[PDB]
């Protein structure tokens, strides 16, 4: 506190009223956890799956490059 400014440094501050604000902090917890879950749901599915499928079977094509059969 200073004569013209009050600064409150809080570890965890929520704007709601009652003492039961864990019941409203849980909403943010659940939302952020769901986002972090769906992210890893997209990292594997999109990136690591397709980018190995593309590199899987290239060699079978390059060896028959010059064949006249």
């Amino acid at each position: 506190v200073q004569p013209h400014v009050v600064t409150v440094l809080a570890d965890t501050a929520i704007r709601a009223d009652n003492l039961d604000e864990a019941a409203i902090l849980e909403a943010r917890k659940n939302a952020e956890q769901l986002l972090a879950n769906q992210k890893s749901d997209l990292d594997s599915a999109a990136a690591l799956a397709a980018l190995a499928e593309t590199a899987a079977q290239l060699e079978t094509i390059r060896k028959i490059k010059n064949r006249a059969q």
Partner: protein, 288 residues
Amino acid sequence: ANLKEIRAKVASIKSTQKITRAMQMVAASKMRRAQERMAQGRPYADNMRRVIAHLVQANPEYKHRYMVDRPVKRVGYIIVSSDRGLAGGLNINLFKKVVQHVKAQQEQSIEVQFALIGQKAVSFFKNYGGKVLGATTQIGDAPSLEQLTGSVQVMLDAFDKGELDRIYLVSNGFVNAMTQKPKVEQLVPLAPAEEGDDLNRTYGWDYIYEPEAEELLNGLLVRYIESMVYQGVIENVACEQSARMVAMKAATDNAGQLIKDLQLIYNKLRQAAITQEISEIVGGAAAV
């Protein structure tokens, strides 16, 4: 030579090329999000630095154990990394830096202890050996400060017993939108953070300390160190996002080159097949 297989392969590669472009699209947006989230942690640290500096300068009687440099016998490292790969050479470069620093500390005959954050660091330094004190996994993009109190609390508790003398923070720095640099910085032996401020401009007023100043100073220092660790983790998250964007763009370019090579091979094979078919038909017709 089963040209439809080659056509299917080309189609699949072109599809994966579209897949990666969207991942780059998303990584840019999250880099923006983490970048603007780094800014919201500034005023808390600024105010805490100001208060701590004024308190320590106005009452110079005693020196806290976090502000005095005692001789070093063991140091510590808080290593933050990502949870999943496919983000450039971020973790590899960071681990090379920390390994070189540890090797440099080895000749001083001072051993090291670790506190790992992120799956990649956990695996790398579980295979590396060393003296682990704690581990944390699945941090996420917007970590809560509660998730980070474990490692910093363990490191500080080890410091308070005289077991540790320095505790370095190992992370990445956000230079620009496309470049990241590894960093190794000490935090517990607090380097005087612009302590020259508020000596010429200081006024003749002190606070009214409800508790004794020593306890208040200790409580301030612990929270300040924790906030430093948190806002050092957030910057690493932003750097990871930028690295992933760059890697996805590079993968898109490489797939685009693969397409241009496979098209030439396919065309050559198509012409060869047509020639063989016509030769066989003409031969069979002339033999009858």
